[PDB]
Amino acid sequence: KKGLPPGTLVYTGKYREDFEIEVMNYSIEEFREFKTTDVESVLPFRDSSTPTWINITGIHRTDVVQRVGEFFGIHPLVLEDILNVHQRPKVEFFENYVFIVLKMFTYDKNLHELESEQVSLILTKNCVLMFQEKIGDVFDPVRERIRYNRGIIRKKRADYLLYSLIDALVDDYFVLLEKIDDEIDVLEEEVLERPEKETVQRTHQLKRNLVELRKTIWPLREVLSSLYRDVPPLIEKETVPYFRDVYDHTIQIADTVETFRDIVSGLLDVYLSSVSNKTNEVMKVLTIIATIFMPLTFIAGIYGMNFGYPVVLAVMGVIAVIMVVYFKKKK
């Protein structure tokens, strides 16, 4: 739905069940993790000269974001955007912090429909502050790769941490495409070799979903494009050439999606031709068994007049052959 105030703090999303603030402060050497539901127990991490990750799951608490935002020096309107989930993904560069809004998807296979949660990211000094609206994410491997010190996460700084969550979120889209490639694959057979009923409505659902998809990658692609040209906190030849290979991913997604929305585009045209081909066969059979049985039931019509038996049957049986011969141009 919509708002009508001047720039307040309303939450438009519809996930009012969960609230769980997780934090992962780490150095080149160490880390902890906890799940406090207290607001204040995370504010002292602003000055921690070591990479923190203050994940605030459950945005519906406008009051929680209001406090954290007033403390971290976050602008009043850039908080509103965190709460307003009906927004195109963007990157906002500021004097202190980099602000990113992203959306991650869930495709219900079978029940052809996709659902969208909006994740906000604020990068400031050594804090990648996060905002989810519901419990559960695709950021499970990244926190696990900090947990069992796997790879080059602990070794590197705090801005690199952002370019690890963003890899994890973009990587998820590769799953969605995989589900849809395998979707099309089937709902395409359903047009060649299954000309039934709700195959059409299943096809229109796909275009609908693909448009819905497209108009959330094409912007998310621009985020990593705009996150590439500029960047204040970057550590040039460390974190920049890294996400070149996430902005590379962000392209392949919105390139794959443009393939799907180009195959599915001309799929209903396959149907209409496949169907008009069937309504040729049926049409044809009707015209045959009415050019052998409509001429003959006319002969056997006159000879019911009230005013050689094998002379009429011979001349009927010969016409039913001057017919099935003439119908060798048509078969």
Tokens of 36: 């406090």
Burial label, 260 (beta-carbon count in 10 A; 0-12, 13-18, 19+): buried
Distances (CA, A) of 185 to 165, 182, 188, 296: 31, 5, 6, 50
- Distance separating alpha carbons of residues 7 and 182, to the nearest angstrom: 43
**Residue 190 contact partner, candidates its own copies, Ca ion, none, CB within 5 to 8 A by sort of partner:** none
User: Taking CB under 8 A as the criterion, which residues in 158-187 touch its own copies?
Assistant: 164, 167, 171, 174-175, 178
Nearer to its own copies, 41 or 287 (CB): 287
User: Taking CB under 5 A as the criterion, which residues in 135-164 touch Ca ion?
Assistant: 135
Q: Is 39 in the site for its own copies (CB under 8 A)?
A: no
List CB contacts of 115: < 8 A, sequence separation 6 or more: 105, 106, 108
Nearer to Ca ion, 167 or 222 (CB): 167
Q: What angle do CA 327, 329, 331 make, to 5 degrees?
A: 70
Nearer to its own copies, 15 or 242 (CB): 242
* Residue of 212, 239, 251, 254 whose CA lies nearest to 112: 212
List CB contacts of 37: < 8 A, sequence separation 6 or more: 19, 20, 21
Q: Using an 8 Å Cβ cutoff, are 147 and 24 in contact?
A: no
Contact pattern from residue 203 through residue 232 relative to its own copies, giving x for each residue in contact according to CB under 8 A and a dash for the rest: xx--xx--xx--x-----------------
Q: Is 63 in the site for its own copies (CB under 8 A)?
A: no
**Residue 291 contact partner, candidates Ca ion, its own copies, none, CB within 5 to 8 A by sort of partner:** its own copies
Q: Is 245 in the site for Ca ion (CB under 5 A)?
A: yes
Stretch binding its own copies (CB under 8 A), from 38-46, 52-60, 120-128, 149-157: 149-157
Q: Is 43 in the site for its own copies (CB under 8 A)?
A: no
The residue from 241, 266, 304, 308 that contacts Ca ion (CB under 5 A) is 304
Q: Beta strands 90-93 and 98-108: pairing type?
A: antiparallel
Min dist. Cβ of residue 216 to Ca ion (A): 16
Applying CB under 5 A, the residues found at the interface with Ca ion are 18, 81, 135, 167, 171, 245, 304
